[PDB]
Amino acid sequence: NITIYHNPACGTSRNTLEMIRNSGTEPTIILYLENPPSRDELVKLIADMGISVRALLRKNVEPYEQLGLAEDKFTDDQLIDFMLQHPILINRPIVVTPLGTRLCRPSEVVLDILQDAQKGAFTKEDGEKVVDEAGKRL
Ligand SMILES: O=S([O-])[O-]
Ligand SMILES: [Cs+]
Ligand SMILES: [Cs+]
Ligand SMILES: [Cs+]
Ligand SMILES: [Cs+]
Ligand SMILES: [Cs+]
Ligand SMILES: [Cs+]
Ligand SMILES: [Cs+]
Ligand SMILES: [Cs+]
Ligand SMILES: [Cs+]
Ligand SMILES: [Cs+]
DSSP states (O other), rough: OOEEEEEETOOOOOOOOHHHTTTOOOEEEEOOOOOOTOOHHHHHHHHHTTHHHHBBOOOOHHHHHHHHTTTSSOOOHHHHHHHHHGGGGBOOOOOEEEEEEEEEEGGGGGGGSSSOOSSSSEEEEHHHHHHTTTTTBB
């Protein structure tokens, strides 16, 4: 039972999805840009991820820029409501498994919450080796 909030245009997100698969599970895939979490869900995801609201914000996207989110002038709930109204602000990928929830940045964070070991060596799409055939992280 695994869920990934996925952006196919994002290599971090692609690598994460493939590591999930390499553990032998096909996750439920949520295209968050189209189908963002509800407020309650988003609030829960953030709590489980154990990072701050601001740490989930993606920089370098149009609403972050134009809404001036770089500046320290926003409460956590203000920031939550911006994420819900402008889903590209939600950084990615977020992964939920029975073990926990993580913002998988870098992608190999997902290894922490996958219950089953990688079934063989994993190499990122740019060639960065993550685990060898024997399962050791490099
Ligand atoms: O793809 S950017 O968020 O690092
Ligand atoms: Cs699932
Ligand atoms: Cs499985
Ligand atoms: Cs939803
Ligand atoms: Cs960018
Ligand atoms: Cs836009
Ligand atoms: Cs736009
Ligand atoms: Cs500004
Ligand atoms: Cs693990
Ligand atoms: Cs292995
Ligand atoms: Cs990269």
